[PDB]
Structure formats: C-alpha cells, structure tokens
A paper describes a structure:
Among these applications, antitumor treatment with therapeutic antibodies is primarily based on antibody-dependent cellular cytotoxicity (ADCC), which is promoted through interaction between the Fc region of immunoglobulin G1 (IgG1) and Fcγ receptor IIIa (FcγRIIIa) on the surface of immune effector cells, such as natural killers and macrophages. Namely, removal of the core fucose residue from Fc glycans causes dramatic enhancement of ADCC through improved IgG1-FcγRIIIa interaction. Crystallographic studies have indicated that binding of IgG1-Fc to FcγRIIIa is mediated not only by protein-protein interactions but also by carbohydrate-protein and carbohydrate-carbohydrate interactions.
To provide a structural basis for the negative effects of core fucosylation of IgG1-Fc glycans, we determined the crystal structure of fucosylated IgG1-Fc complexed with FcγRIIIa at 2.40-Å resolution. For crystallization, we used a soluble form of FcγRIIIa (sFcγRIIIa), which consisted of the extracellular domains and possessed two N-linked oligosaccharides at Asn45 and Asn162, while the remaining three N-glycosylation sites were mutationally eliminated. As expected, the overall structure of the complex formed between fucosylated IgG1-Fc and sFcγRIIIa was essentially identical to that formed with nonfucosylated Fc glycoform, with a root-mean-square deviation value of 0.30 Å for the 578 superimposed Cα atoms. In the crystal structure, the Asn297 glycans of Fc molecules showed well-defined electron density corresponding to a nonasaccharide containing a terminal galactose residue at the α1,6 arm. By contrast, N-glycans of sFcγRIIIa gave electron densities only for the reducing-terminal residues, i.e., GlcNAc1, GlcNAc2, and Man3 at Asn45 and GlcNAc1 and Fuc at Asn162. This is also in marked contrast to the observation of the same sFcγRIIIa in complex with the nonfucosylated Fc glycoform, in which the Asn162 glycan is extensively involved in interactions with the Fc glycan. Because the sFcγRIIIa glycoprotein used in the crystallization had a homogeneous glycoform exclusively exhibiting the bi-antennary complex-type oligosaccharide Gal2GlcNAc2Man3GlcNAc2(Fuc), the ambiguous electron density of the Asn162 glycan of sFcγRIIIa indicates its conformational disorder, presumably because the intermolecular carbohydrate-carbohydrate interaction was weakened in the presence of the core fucose residue of the Fc glycan.
Numbering used by the authors:
A (entry chain B): 230 to 444
B (entry chain C): 10 to 30, 42 to 52, 56 to 73, 76 to 174
C (entry chain A): 232 to 444
Write the structure that this text describes.
C-alpha cells in the first residue's frame, strides 16, 4: 500500500565528513535530505544559504523510490574548507506542495574552543600474545570538537583491519576515542612499525602520527 | 460586516464567508463575499454597502500548520474564552496541548477546542497550541490574552 | 497501518548488571504517557512467555508538567528467566485506546560469547602529564549487554568512562574503558582492577589487575 503522510515531507541536514574538511585535496559537502515526499507532489525546490547569502552551486540528485512508496530527494552542496572550520552556517530551504511553508534547516561546526588531541599508542597486552591475532590500540583524547578522523598505516601502506569507537564525552567536556587495529601476530613479531594517523582541526597541519612496534 | 465562521485570524486555504447589514483595503470588488481558499493577499481591512457604510472589520490570513483562533483577545472576568487550535486544511491533529506561559494547561488525544467557561485573572498570559500531524511535531505562534474586571 | 492519538507505551528492560549479580533485583518497567485527565484509568496485564503473571507493582499516576498523566508498572524479574530468553509482555488498557496496546521485549538473541579482558598501561608519552590513562580492553563478547567498572583497595574508582560496544568484523563486540588517575598514584605503584560482568563468564564475573612494573 501507500502511507498517509499527513505532515508532508521532513528534512535532515548533514555535515561534511571530518577528513573532507581538513585535507585541502578533498571535497567537503553538506547534504540536504528530504524524505516522505509523496508520489502525487514529488517536486522539491532547494534554496541554499551561507551565512544568509544565497548560493547556486548545489547538485540536484535524481529522486529515489523508497520501499514505503515515498521518494527520498537529496541536494548536495560543496563547501569551502575555511568557511566550515570558521563556523559559517549552512541553510537548506526545502519547498514542496504538501507543506504550508518552506522547511528551513541550518548546520554549522560545533561552537566552543578547539582542543588539540593527545594521541597514544598502546601495544598488545601480554595475555593477548598467545593468540594468532593481536590488537594494537590508539587512544585519542582531550579533543574538541568531536569531528575527527583516524586511520592506520605500516611502511607507507594503509592498514585497514581496524575499528574505531565513536567519540565519547569525557569529564572535562573534551572527547576521547579508541581505535583497535587487529594484525597477524607474525607481523608484530617481525618488528614492523605500525602507525595511528589522526586528523583534527586543532592539530598542526590537521595531522599527527604516532607509531608503535615490538621492544 | 459579519464573518462566517467568526474567526478573523485564518489560515491559507481556509474558506471564509462575509455578510452585510464592498471595499477591500478601500477599493472595489468583483461582486455584490465568498473567499473559497484564502491567501495572504485576502488579508486586510473590509467594509460594505448597497444601506449605510459599515465599520472597519480586519481579516488576518496566516501561513502555518497551526493557528490559535479566538473571537477576540480581551475578556471581562467571568466571560467564556473559546480557543480553537486550527490545523492547515483541517489536517488531522493528535496529542494536542494548549499551553499558557510556556506550561501545558490542557491536553487532548484528538484535536478539540479548549473552552474556558468562566475567565479569571489567572487566565492572562501568552498561549499557543501544538500537536502531531502524522508524526510531525507542529506548533502555532503565540497570542496574548488579557483579562480585565 | 498507523494509529491516531491516545496514550503511548514504552517498555524498558532491566539493567544488565542487575540480571547477572544475584544480590540485585532486575525489573522490567512499563511506562504509559499521555494519559488524559478525562480517562486516567490504566490497567496493566503482564504475560511471561504467554503466561499471565500478577505480582507486578503499579505506582499511582503522576501529574506531568504538560498536564498529562504518566503511570509506571514495575514487574520484578527472575535473573535466570531473563538470561534464558523469556519474553515479557506488557498490555495496557484504557478507555481512550480503541484496542489495548501490547509491547514485548527480551534479551537479545544469539549465541553468547565470553569476553576476553586485557588491561593496558599508559603510553610512555603520557607519563609527562599530571594524570594518566589506564585502559581496559574487553572484546569477543556477545551479546552487547555488559557492565565494566574500575576498583582499587576494594572501592570503586571515580573517574572513568567506557566507550559503547562496537561491533567487530566477526559479529562479536568490543569496547574500551578508560580510567584516569593522578600520575603519582600510578608511579607510587597502586593496584587498579578492571571488573567485567557478562553472562558468558564463569560466575558472570572476571577482573584483571594493572599496576606499574
Ligand atoms: C519511508 O522510508 C524512508 C527511508 O526508509 C529506509 O529504507 C527502508 C528500506 C528502511 O530500512 C528504513 O530503515 C530506512 O530508513 C524513511 O526515511 C527515514 O526517515 C527517518 C525519520 O523517520 C530518518 O531518520 C533520521 O536519521 C538520521 C540519521 O540518518 C543518517 O543515518 C542513517 C543510519 O542511521 C542513514 O540511513 C541515513 O541515510 C543518514 O545517513 C547519512 O546520510 C548522509 C547523506 O547521505 C551522509 O552524509 C554525507 O555522506 C557523504 C558520503 O556518503 C559525504 O561524506 C558527505 O560529505 C556527507 O554530507 C552520512 O554519512 C550518512 N550517515 C550514515 C550512513 O551513518 C537521524 O539523525 C535523525 O534523528 C534525529 O531526528 C529525529 C526526528 O525524526 C530524532 O528522533 C532524533 O533524536 C534526532 O534528533 C537530532 O538529534 C541530534 C543529536 O543526536 C541533534 O543534533 C538534532 O538537532 C536533533 N533533532 C533534529 C535533527 O531534528 C532521524 O532518526 C532516516 O534518515 C530516513 N532514512 C533515509 C535513508 O533517508 C521514512 O521515514 C519512511 N517513512 C514512513 C512514513 O514510513
Ligand atoms: C508530556 O510529558 C511526558 C514526560 O515529561 C518529561 O518531563 C518533562 C519535564 C519534560 O522534560 C519532558 O521532555 C520529559 O519527557 C512526555 O513523556 C515522554 O514521551 C516521549 C514520547 O513522546 C518518550 O520518548 C521515548 O523515550 C524513550 C527513552 O526513554 C528513556 O530515556 C529518557 C531520556 O532519554 C527518559 O526521560 C525516560 O524516562 C526513559 O528513561 C528510562 O526509564 C526507564 C524506566 O523508568 C529506566 O529503566 C529502569 O531503570 C531502573 C533504575 O532506576 C531499573 O534498573 C529498571 O530495571 C529499569 O527498567 C531507564 O533507566 C531510563 N533510561 C534513562 C534515564 O536513560 C525512547 O526509547 C523512545 O524512542 C523510541 O520510540 C520513538 C517513538 O516515539 C522512536 O521515534 C524512537 O526512534 C525510538 O524507537 C524505538 O526504539 C526502541 C529501542 O531501540 C525499539 O523498541 C522500537 O523498535 C522503536 N519504536 C517504537 C517503540 O515505536 C522515545 O523517545 C519519553 O520517554 C517520555 N518521558 C517520560 C519521562 O516518560 C510526554 O511525551 C509529554 N506529552 C506531550 C503531549 O507533550
Ligand atoms: C490589503 O492590505 C493588507 C495589510 O497591509 C495586505 O497584507 C499584506 O500583504 C503582503 C503581501 O501580500 C504581506 O507581505 C508578505 O510578508 C512578508 C512581511 O514580513 C514579506 O517579507 C513577504 O515578502 C511578503 O511580501 C504583508 O505581510 C501583509 N501584511 C499584513 C499585516 O497582513 C494585503 O495584501 C492587502 N490586500 C490587497 C488585495 O491589496
Ligand atoms: C514537540 O517538541 C517540543 C519541543 O521541541 C521543539 O519543537 C519541535 C517542533 C521540534 O522542531 C524540535 O526540534 C524543537 O526543539 C517538545 O517539548 C514536545 O514534547 C513535543 N510536543 C508534543 C505535543 O508532542
Ligand atoms: Cl533504557
């Protein structure tokens, strides 16, 4: 069947990926997502504003039929790295026939004093070394805002067999997280140096690296 | 110069009907009035003639999901206050709360008018309503009600 | 379909720690909000795997700041019933509901798996700071229901935060708990313990120590 949609469409507005705002080579984007668009009134008009000034460079995506018989309708705006990190507000205005007025949504970087992450690599526990795989740990703490990217490398090559916890509010209002890279024990015993890479606005060049090996 | 319904504040797409005992913003009209589906331009001053010239009667058309309607905004002690939480296109509204001074005063499972039969001094403050249209949380703008003796 | 206005019902499970420690009482809590003054009477029927049970302790209705009533029923639960995966059903009846509202919960399904617990001292680089981070890594557990705590000289440590469970690539969960302590206490050689309570441990409990060496 088809659902009733008495309130018409709803809007969700999302920030750029943290790494995208911090590396000049990459392309950071704000994404305005409209859901519960009916088949009968499926057109969505987007206006975009940066600190109240209209901009015209958004990409209009083809609408997407959802399994519940609604459309998902999306507009994506590329932003300037400096504007996002300087705290400009990005406003998405969504117009649709099923609504009494336009829905407006705003997003910016979290406000408040940036704080530099402290980064610490921790070897496997003596008790894990009986296993075939071991856990290399990266602790990242004392950072604000929560927007951060974390990756691993060895010998100039990405190491991808890792999981990172979400950011966690610490008692001083800063954030921390942990990243766990699982490696074959042979590779650790051989003396390979692994590195935990952290990207955050408050780090010099938005980048730091801490390394870890057998001793 | 009678309004049918009595609501002088209305919402875009509301039907209004006007009765005589016309000059829309002191200016001539199409016929000698039924508003089939209001818009912001249908707002303003209204007078009538065919008899004498009538008093001014104001009509506010508003844009929104909800509109808190009353017959007037100033009430004598012991007068009845009739509030209506009017939804755009009379869209089904549920879990409706009428607030006074930022506090929930009366709650309804389904949209219902909030009738106060005997006004007291304690009934002064800013009022608005809110509720759910499907699963969307919507609210009206506030209005001030004052009570005198 | 979807339903219109009326009371709403939310059903909450017991705290994981309460289901594992026999000295604690685990509760299942049925909460009913948006009860009008016009029809304030709320009846709770409680079913365990199908079997109606009485013995649920219903608090009296409480006036909320938004002019609605909220009513809580609390069913005490048997530790082993929750762990064996029995369904707990809360049925709420009230005049403004056309049909009664029913809610069901149980312990997450799937094959339980024992956490491994590893404590990790502070990185040498952190020993420059006023405080330091003792880390407890807990991995390989299923389901995610767990409690982790820090202790020293038989008393809980104050200042720790634990990440939420994260899903590992093998379908088990891990987490880290960070205990912050003054560096003096670590370098003076005080002993700290990470304690872990999970259904798949022997005695639903294990602990691992950590101290300077
Ligand atoms: C009909 O169907 C549709 C679609 O249904 C779906 O498909 C079917 C098959 C089902 O399986 C179903 O589960 C699927 O959803 C329904 O559409 C859904 O509608 C609900 C609301 O009803 C939406 O729920 C919100 O989700 C938000 C998070 O969404 C993201 O994450 C989910 C997974 O968790 C994804 O599925 C979403 O798509 C979103 O994912 C993000 O998408 C971005 C854009 O693509 C990504 O960013 C970009 O990424 C690219 C690269 O890909 C680049 O990097 C760009 O630079 C970058 O911009 C992003 O990476 C991606 N994230 C991922 C994958 O993780 C929630 O945030 C939101 O919660 C808020 O609002 C709630 C109100 O409803 C409220 O209850 C919450 O509390 C919360 O409130 C906020 O809280 C925060 C703090 O926590 C505050 O800061 C806010 O102020 C506060 N209030 C707000 C914002 O008001 C919702 O839960 C859901 O997203 C949507 N799905 C999809 C796919 O669009 C529809 O509802 C159905 N209708 C009916 C009638 O049944
Ligand atoms: C009028 O007012 C009342 C109450 O007023 C309140 O106080 C005033 C002053 C205001 O501040 C106001 O904001 C306050 O709420 C309003 O009542 C609220 O109504 C909303 C719904 O409109 C309810 O929202 C749901 O909340 C759930 C989370 O609730 C807990 O957490 C919040 C804080 O986040 C607390 O405030 C709540 O009280 C709940 O807290 C838990 O309570 C448990 C029971 O007491 C505790 O467990 C017990 O603990 C004891 C120890 O003390 C023992 O150990 C026991 O053993 C143990 O059982 C528990 O500790 C405690 N947790 C805490 C404190 O963290 C959300 O889960 C829920 O979200 C689901 O449903 C949504 C649909 O509405 C959906 O959109 C969501 O995505 C989500 O979806 C569901 O997800 C679940 C789980 O994943 C799945 O099962 C389902 O698939 C899925 N869908 C479903 C079920 O459809 C809601 O957000 C709110 O709880 C309620 N508040 C209170 C206090 O009752 C009322 O709405 C107002 N009315 C009007 C008209 O304005
Ligand atoms: C009769 O006179 C009334 C009273 O002035 C007119 O109402 C006004 O109508 C205009 C446009 O229709 C409204 O302006 C709009 O709103 C905002 C104002 O913040 C503006 O930014 C928009 O761009 C838009 O122009 C105006 O608010 C409204 N004023 C009031 C008090 O209701 C009415 O239009 C006149 N009717 C005719 C037929 O001439
Ligand atoms: C509706 O929400 C109230 C306050 O939330 C604010 O208003 C709504 C429209 C959302 O846009 C939200 O993001 C805003 O922050 C709640 O206090 C209230 O419980 C809800 N009202 C009802 C009647 O359910
Ligand atoms: Cl909970």
């Amino acid at each position: 069947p088809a659902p009733e949609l008495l309130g018409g469409p709803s809007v969700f507005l999302f920030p750029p990926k943290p790494k995208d705002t911090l590396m000049i080579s990459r392309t950071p984007e704000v994404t305005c997502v409209v859901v519960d668009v009916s088949h009968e009134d499926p057109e969505v008009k987007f206006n975009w504003y940066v600190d109240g000034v209209e901009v015209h460079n958004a990409k209009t995506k083809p609408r997407e039929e959802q399994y519940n018989s609604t459309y998902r309708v999306v507009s994506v705006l590329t932003v300037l790295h400096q504007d996002w990190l300087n705290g400009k507000e990005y406003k998405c205005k969504v117009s649709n026939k099923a609504l009494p007025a336009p829905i407006e949504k705003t997003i910016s970087k979290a406000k408040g004093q940036p704080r530099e992450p402290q980064v610490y690599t921790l070897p496997p526990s003596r008790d894990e070394l009986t296993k075939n795989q071991v856990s290399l740990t990266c602790l990242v703490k004392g950072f604000y805002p929560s927007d951060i990217a974390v990756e691993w490398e060895s010998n100039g090559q990405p190491e991808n067999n890792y999981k990172t916890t979400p950011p966690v509010l610490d008692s001083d209002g800063s954030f921390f997280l942990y990243s766990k890279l699982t490696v074959d024990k042979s590779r650790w015993q051989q003396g390979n140096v692994f590195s935990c890479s952290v990207m955050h606005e408050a780090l010099h060049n938005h980048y730091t690296q801490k390394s870890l090996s057998l001793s | 110069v009678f309004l049918e319904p009595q609501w002088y504040r209305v919402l875009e797409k509301d039907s209004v009907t006007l009765k005589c005992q016309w000059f829309h913003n002191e200016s001539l009209i199409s016929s000698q009035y039924f508003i089939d589906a209001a818009t912001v331009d249908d707002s303003g001053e209204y007078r009538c003639q065919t008899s004498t010239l009538s008093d001014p009667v104001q009509l506010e058309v508003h844009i929104g999901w909800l509109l808190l309607q009353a017959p007037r905004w100033v009430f004598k002690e012991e007068d009845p206050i009739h509030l209506r939480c009017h939804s755009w296109k009379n869209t089904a509204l549920h879990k409706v709360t009428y607030l006074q001074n930022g506090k929930g005063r009366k709650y309804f499972h389904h949209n219902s008018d909030f009738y106060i039969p005997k006004a007291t001094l304690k009934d002064s403050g800013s009022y608005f309503c809110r509720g759910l249209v499907g699963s969307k949380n919507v609210s009206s703008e506030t209005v001030q009600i004052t009570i005198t003796q």
